[PDB]
Design a binder for this molecule. Structure first.
Ligand SMILES: O=c1ccn([C@@H]2O[C@H](COP(=O)(O)OP(=O)(O)O)[C@@H](O)[C@H]2O)c(=O)[nH]1
Lengths: 39, 365
């Protein structure tokens, strides 16, 4: 998939494309599917 | 050679401007009619049969289920893009008090979902930010007008707050008037579409005509994604305003870049005519911007830039009209009223009773 191309991961997070969806890796301090939440 | 080119373009300009009628009778567009053509067309294919509960249940798999039930907002627990859902909810929430019941399948993915070359498994209705004629999706104003646009180094929480952006770009456009802007083509963005390649390759061959370089996005894989050059730095929206000639391209679907370019009072070159947002129908080629066909050649870029560089007053006139259009007809109020009008006209199409669903979470207000 190409979901990561639009930079869905906030606050310095990094992204990995699956075939289905995508997943964010969030830096320490941020949480949520898109790193949108404070830890 | 240069003369045949000129005649063609001036011919296209005069024809466009002579046929141009403003999107509303008065500039204030008090009854929210500027972008009404689009919402009519999008809803039209449902006009006769309407929307069965079965159609809603059939489409639920293509997006995020929203339910307005008795002036409260309910949603699937799982938003695929939470920050995008936040953006959408900013607009839904204040309207939920004054709005009837309805189910909304709102797709928050970049690409539309209802291919009208398939069907009738792709019958809808599904809401998407961007489409072409190939798709049945109903356009809505993108989340990013409030929140959840692409996250970048300069905008780590996602490009949003179009209200604030308008004021910031208004100030910057005032500060760098036409004659002050650099006489070069400019683009800074990532390789979300290979339609973007020829401009970047021209730039490398001729930096004195075009300054265009590839940034890196979060989907980066190989150096092919920047066509084997080191990833360039991000350039702020307001720093685009120091170039006369600003390029826009589709990405996965339409790009959020476009609207920002107009508020620089620079001349916008919009490449391709397929990928839409709700407000593109009223942006008119040659009236508000310079249209270029998909996959422009380096020779096309050279000819068109050469022309406008030698026809400055004409350039500034188009730029000024594009600016004015976005200033006057892409206000927050235009976004808010489009949303309202679209939902009101849509609810009329439902041929079933909206009933609660316990698995949905309460959103607000
Ligand atoms: O240097 C840059 C690069 C990108 N962007 C913005 O970031 C978003 C993502 O741009 P990109 O080219 O990565 O992808 P697109 O969304 O255009 O496919 C768009 O709104 C761009 O206008 C920006 O403001 N400065």
């Amino acid at each position: 998939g190409d979901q990561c191309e639009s930079n869905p991961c906030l606050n310095g997070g990094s992204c990995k494309d699956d075939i289905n969806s995508y997943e964010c890796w969030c830096p320490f301090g941020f949480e949520g599917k898109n790193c949108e939440l404070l830890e | 050679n240069e003369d045949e080119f000129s005649f063609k373009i001036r011919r296209q300009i005069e024809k466009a401007n002579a046929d141009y009628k403003p999107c509303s009778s008065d500039p204030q567009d008090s009854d929210c009619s500027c972008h009404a053509n689009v919402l009519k067309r999008d809803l039209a294919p449902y006009k006769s049969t309407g929307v069965t509960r079965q159609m809603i249940e059939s489409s639920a798999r293509y997006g995020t289920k929203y339910k307005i039930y008795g002036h409260r907002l309910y949603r699937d627990a799982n938003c695929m893009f939470p920050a995008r859902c936040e953006g959408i909810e900013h607009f839904l929430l204040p309207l939920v008090a004054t709005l009837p019941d309805m189910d909304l399948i709102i797709n928050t993915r970049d690409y539309p979902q209802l291919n009208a070359a398939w069907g009738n498994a792709a019958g809808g209705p599904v809401f998407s930010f961007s489409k072409t004629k190939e798709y049945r999706d109903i356009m809505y104003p993108a989340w990013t007008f409030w929140a959840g646009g692409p996250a970048t180094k300069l905008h780590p929480r996602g490009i949003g707050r179009w209200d604030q952006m308008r004021e910031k770009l208004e100030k910057r456009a005032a500060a760098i008037p036409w004659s002050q802007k650099r006489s070069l083509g400019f683009f800074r963005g990532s390789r979300t579409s290979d339609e973007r390649d020829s401009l970047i390759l021209l730039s490398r061959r001729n930096p004195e005509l075009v300054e265009a370089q590839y940034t890196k996005n979060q989907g980066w894989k190989s150096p092919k994604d920047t066509l084997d050059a080191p990833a360039a730095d991000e350039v702020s929206f307001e720093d685009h305003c120091k170039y006369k000639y600003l390029f826009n391209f589709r990405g996965v679907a339409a790009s959020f870049r476009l609207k920002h370019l107009f508020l620089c009072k620079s001349l916008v070159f919009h490449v391709g005519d397929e990928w839409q947002e709700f407000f593109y129908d009223q942006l008119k080629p040659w009236v508000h911007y310079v249209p270029l066909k998909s996959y422009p050649s380096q020779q096309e870029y050279e000819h068109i830039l050469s022309f406008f560089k030698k026809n400055d007053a004409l350039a500034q006139e188009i730029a000024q009209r594009g600016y004015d259009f976005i200033w006057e007809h892409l206000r927050m109020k235009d976004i808010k009223c489009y949303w309202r009008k679209l939902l009101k006209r849509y609810v009329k199409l439902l041929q079933y009773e909206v009933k609660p669903e316990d698995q949905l979470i309460y959103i607000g207000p």
